[PDB]
């Protein structure tokens, strides 16, 4: 993806966020960060992965934008310069959205292979059983040498 489509795609995903709330420079800054760590030009298989991290990072920068300003710590207002009176009371809303977004990556790209390897059971596949067995660094229960080593006990995991 080129440098111009990322802003166009991010704004649509974020519900048409305005320019003043998030500049196009900041979007490029996070986009460029993941480009060099995932060398997207060399391998285009990480386009969904780089896109997902870019949007999440932008939300993180939005949350810290409410902090470091007066918007986060105020919860009342009152204006009166005569007969005009106004009283009203996004830091809290951006929080749960980040948690929700981290749980629904399909909203960004359906091809992220989310939620596929939750449950793992060992010893029920030949491919996995031989991978551990043939590993030269593996140390299993049949290697119990005891007080001093004996030639009756194997020193390697793989069968001869």
């Amino acid at each position: 993806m080129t440098n111009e489509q990322v802003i166009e795609l991010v704004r649509v995903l974020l519900g048409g966020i305005t320019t003043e709330e998030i500049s196009d420079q900041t979007i490029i800054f996070f986009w460029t960060k993941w480009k060099l760590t995932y060398d997207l030009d060399n391998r285009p298989e990480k386009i969904p992965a780089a896109l997902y991290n870019t949007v999440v990072d932008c939300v993180r920068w939005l949350i810290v934008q409410e902090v470091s300003s007066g918007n986060s710590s105020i919860r009342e207002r009152f204006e009166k310069i005569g007969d005009e009176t106004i009283s009203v009371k996004s830091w809290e809303s951006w929080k749960d959205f980040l948690d929700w977004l981290e749980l629904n990556p399909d909203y960004i790209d359906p091809s992220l292979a989310f939620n596929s390897s939750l449950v793992i059971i060992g010893g029920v596949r030949k491919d996995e059983f031989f991978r551990v067995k043939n590993n030269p660094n593996s140390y299993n229960g049949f290697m119990e040498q005891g007080v001093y080593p004996t030639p009756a006990i194997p020193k390697q995991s793989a069968w001869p």
């Binding site: 596949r125 491919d127 991978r131």
Partner: peptide, 9 residues
Amino acid sequence: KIVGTQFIG
């Protein structure tokens, strides 16, 4: 068609 490509967990 290899079996063993995931280690231990």
